[PDB]
Swiss-Prot record, chain B:
Induction: 2-fold by hydroxyurea treatment. Disruption phenotype: Cells missing tonB survive hydroxyurea treatment better than wild-type; further disruption of mazE-mazF and relE-relB yields even better survival. Disulfide bonds: none annotated. It is found in: Cell inner membrane. The chain holds residues 165 to 237 of 239 of the full protein. Residues 1-73 form the TonB C-terminal domain. Belongs to the TonB family. It comes from Escherichia coli (strain K12). Homodimer. Forms a complex with the accessory proteins ExbB and ExbD. This is Protein TonB. Changing residue 12 to I: In strain: ECOR 60.
Amino acid sequence: ARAQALRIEGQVKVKFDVTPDGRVDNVQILSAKPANMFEREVKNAMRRWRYEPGKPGSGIVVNILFKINGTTEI
Amino acid sequence: ARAQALRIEGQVKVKFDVTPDGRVDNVQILSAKPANMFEREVKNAMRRWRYEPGKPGSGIVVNILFKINGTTE
Ligand SMILES: [Br-]
Ligand SMILES: [Br-]
Ligand SMILES: [Br-]
Ligand SMILES: [Br-]
């Protein structure tokens, strides 16, 4: 019943080629972080979630709607 | 080189317990998309980036600053 929020800040390096049309090619992520960053960060964020006390339950399923906004660093 | 932006939209289901103090425990993500969803989606979003034509290069490195904003449905 209580909605919860996800707010995760991060950075990720990418390496790629640029072709004569100005498009990227041969892209690889440079994961600095131990793989599977997104799922770890989501679980970590869920540590801040709080629900009503004295109402425990098990096997609760929630659907998280998210948007990722990013920009290249200048 | 030109700055670029990225926007990814998505959903992820998670399953967990709620303890007497109202905190979550025993969390598992219910992957329904293939693993490495984030990395795949970043690369797919880069398909929209455009740099100056006639100026190819290889091994270009850029850092993407991002924020993930989510809400339970
Ligand atoms: Br925390
Ligand atoms: Br609640
Ligand atoms: Br450029
Ligand atoms: Br597209």
